[PDB]
Every structure is written in structure tokens, then in C-alpha cells.
Subunit: 340 residues, 3 copies
Amino acid sequence: DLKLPRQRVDLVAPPFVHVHEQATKQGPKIMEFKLVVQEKKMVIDEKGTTFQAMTFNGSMPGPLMVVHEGDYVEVTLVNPATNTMPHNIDFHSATGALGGGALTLINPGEQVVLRWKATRTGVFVYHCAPGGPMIPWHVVSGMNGAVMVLPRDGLNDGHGHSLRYDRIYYIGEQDLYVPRDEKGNFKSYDSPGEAYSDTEEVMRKLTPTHVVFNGKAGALTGKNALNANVGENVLIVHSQANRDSRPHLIGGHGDYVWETGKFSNAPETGLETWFIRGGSAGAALYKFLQPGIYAYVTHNLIEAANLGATAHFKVEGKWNDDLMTQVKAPADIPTGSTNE
Amino acid sequence: DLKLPRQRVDLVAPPFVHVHEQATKQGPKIMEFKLVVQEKKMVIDEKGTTFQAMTFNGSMPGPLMVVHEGDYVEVTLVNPATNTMPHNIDFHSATGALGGGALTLINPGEQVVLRWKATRTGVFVYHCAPGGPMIPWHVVSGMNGAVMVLPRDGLNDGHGHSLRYDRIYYIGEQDLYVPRDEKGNFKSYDSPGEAYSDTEEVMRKLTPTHVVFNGKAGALTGKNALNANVGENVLIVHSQANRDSRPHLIGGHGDYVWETGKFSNAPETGLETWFIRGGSAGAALYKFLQPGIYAYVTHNLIEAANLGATAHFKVEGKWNDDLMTQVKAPADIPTGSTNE
Amino acid sequence: DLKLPRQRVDLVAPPFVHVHEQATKQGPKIMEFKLVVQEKKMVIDEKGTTFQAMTFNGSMPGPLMVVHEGDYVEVTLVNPATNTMPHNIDFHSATGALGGGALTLINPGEQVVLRWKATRTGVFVYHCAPGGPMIPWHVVSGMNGAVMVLPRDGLNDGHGHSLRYDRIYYIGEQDLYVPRDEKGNFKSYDSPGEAYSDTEEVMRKLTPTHVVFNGKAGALTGKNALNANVGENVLIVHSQANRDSRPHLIGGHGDYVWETGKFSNAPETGLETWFIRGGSAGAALYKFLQPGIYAYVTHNLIEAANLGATAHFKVEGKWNDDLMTQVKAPADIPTGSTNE
Ligand SMILES: [Cu+2]
Ligand SMILES: [Cu+2]
Ligand SMILES: [Cu+2]
Ligand SMILES: [Cu+2]
Ligand SMILES: [Cu+2]
Ligand SMILES: [Cu+2]
């Protein structure tokens, strides 16, 4: 028997993150989480396209789980009988049994309890992986999230200095493969099973129809922009379970970036754009220096602007004219100019 | 008021680079640059395909700007009235206001002056970003270049040793999206606006029709091959504002490579092939050891050979038979051989 | 004349590797290898699709060559008269003459002998590169392999500690471009020349029809699963000569990963998923901690499950319930549960 204190965590919906400590003096615990599979139709773009999604806890991405190195993570995975297919879970943070996949296959009406030891620090993908062609289909239907395993001393810069965030956001990026009819319009289906054959045809050509953050084009823009303040160190965890991405904070930088996402490696400093290899999570820390709107994109700008992959930060504070200033506002080009 | 000496820089067309110092004892300056937007039809391949391009200073890529850490960069952006649309500029090297984009939107007939402080070392992309779907369209129409921010002590190897280049070249890689007609032939248009709708359809499928260096297939081959000599340390700056690339010098290596392009990080040593994440610049230093023709490619060889993405170096010097030699020239396979 | 001892190596077919030492006290040698080009029809998927392949030594990938830093590698390349086209070889490990390509062009019925000095440590791609559009076509038809140049002291972790593998496997990943007829079925051809025009059309769209390890979907699953044991440190060399990949060991990690594949750089630790930039080889060391089946994939799961890119490891040993355990097997969801 494993004789450690137990602590139940209540997950919250992305892009927010459940409460946790960075540095901790607590010893190892059995951290208890519950993920409930939900198959449901969801809206994925600004024109109202719908999609037969499959999710952990009703969101794309699934929620961010946060533990510390040496914790045991005890996950109750639930597959309600309102669902139509089997599901499971593969933690890239875990060791053995296909990440847990081989121990968590559950039919609708069932649940299972998996424990894995958090021996490896970093941010990691988790995803459903039932077997064979169902693996990609469940993942690109939305069944993926991430887990962060923090060192007990918190983050550091790989050169002996502590790093601490004031705020954390989890950006899950999702590649979607939505069939079109002969007229070029997106097709709708009454169940995931009915969508499968047509969807697999799109998947096979490896070109997503949509690339979205937090499950939908515009999810994190407008009213749902991410808030910050000048001076705050913000950790931005980015995951992509199936396909590469290249995150960029427009008007900012990555001050410290773990592109491969693993805290045993020193972060890179001062990046413009980073790279999340498909099947992983990475993380970037940035201290905001200027107020205003920032866009956070994948820097395939076609994906960002035209397929859905733009988030906004709204940053409060005072403008720093030393860092940047408009010396002269737009004006007519001088009559006496020559420019050739 | 900012009370520093001013220095006007005259830019030159890629792949060359304006004169500059590596290590410097000069203190911070206000470095003055002018970029003039030019919309124009350009030839992009060997069969004479034309393209409605949009450029900074009439080239793809735009010119390389070079400053040092702590300089202020004062850019006059000009949009002549012969142009048809609004433009702006986003410096990935800059902090705030969408990289400057939010302070530089100018209509045809206008100019604007932006100042940004060069607080971050490395090579960085700059690009136009007017807003929404115009962002990718302006970038993939050719409106992108790069800026290098050198440490005042010059480059180093991240282990306490100075690195110095004898020669520098800037390779801007451009993904292009050219519409085809029903017969499969590339379409021509009389203006960028007229090309837009058809071009956006190609863009949406994320597969370029052309991938080119210095604006055209064959730009840097033949008569325009890049020159070097045996023994020279050559810095090769590579940018890609929208899409990943994987540079490789055929017959050489990357002796010191900043793949993510930022000089606060130690370079990697002895690479065969590196990776420029879309939306960034990187840089590789190589000391030539052998004379002859080298091809410089993205190592998706289909893109390199068939879509336009090959440059040549012509290197003068003496062959080193210790490093490589043809022991036996091609000859008939021996009658008495067995090879099974 | 180069006056060193000569040692003939007998290559073996991937995923296995010819016998070699890791650390060695032997001084530099002239290591002699022979590669024989074979053009032949090969089966590439589970439905029996055939393909006009071009290979080194009859396999995709070509065999792994292993030498040490400072060795000279003397390669006899043979192009039998049963072949139909010219071939050559470009070693990314070599310096000059397009990696050897410019010194090894041989017609059917000819052979050539190239020597290159192993001055650069790591794993490296080699591939055919006859010229122009034949370069990608020969590579994506299967003419690529890898060479490993070990330090004479063996591998280390970049922080002063020796690393040693108990077992080594070479996974060559191949992107294939197989034409389809009007009904959507893969086309068959009687020679590589006859396949060329239709194949180049698929290549131009940059989307492979198949992505395979060891030359075929399912090559390294079932009876040909890779064996290991709990406690063994296994080096997994992964190459991709034309296109990016993102390797992942399902249920494991990369304990030490040289993603760019070059042993002068310290490996990254504890990766979930790594990235092989097209045109390179990388390598991951992992010590198995749990028995069972592991899948080894590229983590574009569509490519892995649906286009062919899954291998299996079968690992013997004792299960470690501390690392992972099934706390409760699948069971009906409690009548008294609430889950909303
Ligand atoms: Cu599922
Ligand atoms: Cu996975
Ligand atoms: Cu513009
Ligand atoms: Cu940008
Ligand atoms: Cu060949
Ligand atoms: Cu190559």
C-alpha cells in the first residue's frame, strides 16, 4: 500500500489553471484528479461551423493538471453512458503501459482509476489513444490536454536563479479536419461515428481546415482576451498533441522558453518565435514591459489569421517611450522628397 | 528628448549587407533607416512566372538592418502614392505596440517614423502586418526582411571565445501561393487586389507553389552565386516569416548555429541541417575548408530542387585530399566481382 | 599515401547495426564499406501496394555505418548494370564536393571509390543526389541512410559523465509519394522511369501518401518488433532525409536526446517528443523501466496510425507498480455518482 497523504484537485477550464504552489515544502502526495469524457457537438469558428468533438471535461483542450516532482497522480477517468465510444488516456508524463493507455480503456458506462508517479519535470501532453486509427481520430476530435510537473523548488533559469510566474495560462492548440460538401461548405453530422469516414479522408491529406486555441476561432480574443499587467511574469504553456506549431507573442518575446518543455533543461533566452513539436507541450515565460493589445499566434500567419489560431492579451499599464515611440505620426510624404 | 548621436545607414539589397562593425567601442546611437514600400509585378521562377509582389525597398526579402545592443533604431517607413494599399511594420526585435505595427499604419502617400530600442540580441524577422487576413497576405506577397542586433563585443561561442565572420550573407526564404487556371498554368493579374481572392484560396491549403531565396528560383545560382574563399568564416543569416525551413550547406556544416537566432544562447556546433521556425531568423557560421560549388538548400529536397529553394556558393581555393578524395574514379565493375 | 591500418566492415540490414565498439583505444583507421545500389519493386504497405524503389544495399533505409572521430571512411559505391539510372552519394558527415556527390556519379555497370575523413561527431544522413530534380526523386524513392561518427571515448552527457548503450537500433523514416488513378487506387509501374512523371506530380504537393519506418507500414511491428529488456539503455537513431519528423516512444521518454544529432552538443534530458529536421539524423537514449509493448511513432498521429509510421518495442521484465498501477480496473460508474 502507498501510504501518503491524499489531496483532491478541482480542475478548471482552460486557459485558466487550478490553484497550486510553485515552490513547495510539502512532501510527496497522492494528487487526485477526475476527468470525465464528453462527446458533444461544439462550434469551432466565427461563421458557426459545428463539429463532433470528443473531450476531457467538456473543453478543448482538456484542463491543465499541475503537480510536483515525486507526487503520485491518481486519475479517475469516467466515460458516461451518454457517450458512444470507448476512450482511454495516455500521459506523456508517465512511464509504462503506453502512458496509461493500456490500463484505462473504458466503455460508455464505465470508469477506471490509474496512478502514475511524476518522475519527470516539465509540461507534457495527455491524450486519448484507444488503438489503431482511433488514436489520431480521438486526438484531432479534441481529446488532449496537458499536465505540468514542477520541480519542488519551482522553476529556475538553468544557471542557478529562481524563476517565478505571477500568472499562468494554458493555450491548447487544436488542428481540426472538417469535411466539405461539393459546394465547398463545411458538412455537419449527427454523431461522431457518422462524421468518421468523411473526416478520415480530410485527415489523410494532413492539412487542417481549422487551427484553433481553446477550441474555437476567436476563443481568446474580444471579451475573452487574456489579462495581464506591465511587470508581471506570465507563463504561457502551449500544447499541440498532433501537429507542429510555432508560437509568437506579437510585440513581445519569450524571455525564458523551454521549447521541448522539460524543466531539467535550461530554457532558451530572448526568443522571437518558438517551436512546439507535434505531440508535446512547451512553455514560455515573459515579463510584460508595455501595455496594450498583444496578439499570440502560431507564426504560420495563414493559420493564425485565416484558420483560427490567434489569441489576444490585454495588458494594463503605462507606456514606455524609451522602449518604443512614434517619433512622427503618419503624414504626407514631403513634396521635396526623392526616394529613388 | 533622446540625446544621442545619430547615424544614417544606407541599406543594400540582399543577399549583401550594409557596412557595419562587429565588435564596437562606440556607445549607443540612434541608427536611422528608411524603408520604402514597393508594390510591383516580379518574376519568381525560371519559366517566367510573374507575381504581384509587395516589398520593402523593392526586394524579397527586404534588406538586412544591422545594429548593436542598446542602439535605438529610428525607421522612416514610406508608402508612396503609386501603391494601392495600406502597409505597416512589425519588428520582432522590438517591444510593444505589436512590434511597431500598431504605430506605423500608413496609406499610400504617407510616411511614419518609429523608434525602437534594440534591447534583445540576435537576428529577427520584420514584416508588414496591416490587420486580420491582410497580415498573412502581405507577408507571403514578400513584405518581410530581417534585422540583426549584435552584442557590442561581437559574437561569441557561448563558452567564452570570440567568433568573427569574414563575410555575411542574408538569405530570405519566401513561400509563395500562386493561383493556377483550369489547365494547371499559373495565372497572372494586373494588380495585387485582383490576385487576392484566388491567392487566398491557395494560401488556405498551406502548400506553397514556390519556395524561393532572394525572391526567385535561381536567384542565387549561376552568375549570382555567393562567393567565398577557403579559410573564410561566413555568417549565413536565414529568415522565414511564415513557414518552417531546414537549411543545409551541401558539402559543408554549420560550425556554430543559432537555430532560434538569438545570441544570448550558445550556438550549437557541427550541425548538418538546422531549422528555422516560421516567423523567425536564425544564423549559421561556417569556415570553408574546400573549394568548389556548394549548394545551400532547404532540406526538403522537393522544395529545394522543384519549387525554387537552392542557392550556390562558389568557393575559391586549394583542394584538401586529406578531408576527401576520389580514391578510384568511375570504372567498370570487375568481371570477377560477386556483390550478392 | 595514407598509411593507416585498413578494416573492412560488413554492413547489416536495418534496424540492426554492424558490430562496433563504443569507446575505443584503437587509433585512426581506414574503415572500408561497400554500398551496392539496387533499383527494385518493393511492397510498402499492409494492403500490398508496390513501389518502384531505389536503394542502397536493397533496404530502406540504407544501412547504418558506424566509425569513430578521425577515422577515414573509404566507400566503394557500386551501380550494377541491371540498374537503369545513374546514382551517387552525398555524406552529410563529409567535407567537400557536395558531400561526395560530385565525385561519385556512376552509370549502371560502374563503381567508384570515395574516401572521406570523419572529422565531425554525430549521426548524419547519407543520400543519393544525382543532380537537379533527380535529387529529391532518388531520395524519396528510398536512396538514403545514415552514418554514425562516435567520439573515441564514446558518448557522454555533456556534463562530464559517460553514457553507454546496451543496444542500438536505426529507424529510417521514409516519406513516399505514390500516384493514384481516377478511382483513387494506388498505381503500379514497370520501372522507376515509367513512374517518374506521375510521382513528381504527387511530390510537388508536398504531402506523402505513406510515411514508413524500415521501408514499409508494419515493418517493425508484429513478428519484427524491436526487442529490449527492463534496465537496458537503448540508443534509437532516427533519420529523415527529406521531411521533418517528431519521434515519440509511447510509455517512455528520451532520457538523453541529441535532436540535431551531433555529439559535440550536450543532449537534452527527459523529452516526451523530439524533432528530426528533414535532412538529418538524431538520436535518443532511453533506459527501459517497465516491460510490455511500446509503440514508437512520429507524433503526427495521422502519419503514425494511418500512413504507416509506427514501430513496436517488446520489452521483457517485471512490472513496477510504484511507477504506474491500475488502482481500480474498469467498472460501472457508481449509481450514486454525480459528475456534473
Ligand atoms: Cu477517446
Ligand atoms: Cu502521445
Ligand atoms: Cu504591407
Ligand atoms: Cu511576426
Ligand atoms: Cu540514386
Ligand atoms: Cu543532403
